[PDB]
Amino acid sequence: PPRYVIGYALAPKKQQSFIQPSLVAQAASRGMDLVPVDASQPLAEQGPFHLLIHKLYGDDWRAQLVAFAARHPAVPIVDPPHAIDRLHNRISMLQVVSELDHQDSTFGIPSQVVVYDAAALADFGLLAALRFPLIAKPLVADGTAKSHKMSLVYHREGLGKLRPPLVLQEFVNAGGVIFKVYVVGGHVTCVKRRSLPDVSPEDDASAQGSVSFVPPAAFINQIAGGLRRALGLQLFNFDMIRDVRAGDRYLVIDINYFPGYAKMPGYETVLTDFFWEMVHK
């Protein structure tokens, strides 16, 4: 009964959250050995590996994965950098998701306003017919975590202070609720987040968060399945809203590589079954 080496190249803070003793031991009990990748040596001098999982960015890290992928074509990489690239530009990302087909629920993409420079952020006429609150997000991101963050914006003044180029999306047809859907291979958890039309400094109104494992479950798996086929990613979460006008249409508003799976209890079982699948194809 052979053993599988699962290499992992993660920042220390992501190691602390995701590589917990309970995951290491569960995986070792099933013949899978989680081995940290030395950031101080080339990847080519390390291993061998039966599977490689990472959350690092840079041209050096990318070169290594290209080298590695050429030297070792059979060894799965989670995820390949070419596939994480698809998230780099918010507008290209949502385009790749739009090329899905179709069920008693429909799923669409909300329209986006792209503002490239400071000047336009002042004097672009259309901005003055937007409804608040708005989701703002930098246009390009991969790397620094702040680029991955999506802001709720309550005032025109507060927009005027964001750093362009950014993407603007209306949030008013959502009923104040975002569904964050964690995916590993085939699914995991949904966080329901409720936001409000008034900020909190403006009026003392409340926001709330709950967890489950709320939109139809057969539909969420249909979506999650298509995102994975289209993006070629195995580890992502995706933000979605109900269009509460009809009340049966859903919209994908965001996608994030390798989110915080350790926040969900029982993540160790889900990720260990995933590693098992990946090293047996």
Ligand X SMILES: O=P(O)(O)O[C@H]1[C@H](OP(=O)(O)O)[C@@H](OP(=O)(O)O)[C@H](OP(=O)(O)O)[C@@H](OP(=O)(O)O)[C@H]1OP(=O)(O)O
Annotated binding site for 1D-myo-inositol 6-phosphate: 13, 55, 143, 148, 180, 182, 237, 256, 260, 263
Binding-site residue set for Mg(2+): 239, 254, 256
DSSP class of residue 221 equals: H
User: Can you tell me which of 63, 67, 114, 205 binds a copy of itself, judged by CB under 8 A?
Assistant: 114
Binding-site residue set for ATP: 90, 137, 148, 169, 172, 195, 253-254, 256
Could you tell me the maximum CA-CA distance found in the chain, to the nearest angstrom? 67
Find out whether 193 and 178 touch, Cβ atoms under 8 Å: yes
CB-based burial of residue 189 (10 Å sphere; 0-12 exposed, 13-18 middle, 19+ buried)? buried
Residue ranges binding ligand X (CB under 6 A) = 145, 148-149, 180, 191, 237, 256, 259-260, 263
Stretch that binds a copy of itself, among 46-54, 109-117, 146-154, 210-218 (CB under 8 A): 109-117
Residue 211 is encoded by which pair of tokens? 């967890």
Residue 155's SS3 state is coil
User: Can you tell me which of 6, 10, 18, 178 binds Cl ion, judged by CB under 5 A?
Assistant: 18
C-alpha 136 chain-centroid distance? 16
> Closest distance between a copy of itself and the C-beta of residue 79, in Å?
20
The arrangement of strands across the sheet holding 134-138 comes to 151-153, 134-138, 166-170
Residues in contact with Cl ion by the rule CB under 5 A = 17-18, 260-262
Residues in contact with a copy of itself by the rule CB under 8 A = 89, 91-92, 94-95, 98, 106, 108-117, 119-120, 124-131, 139-140, 165, 170, 249
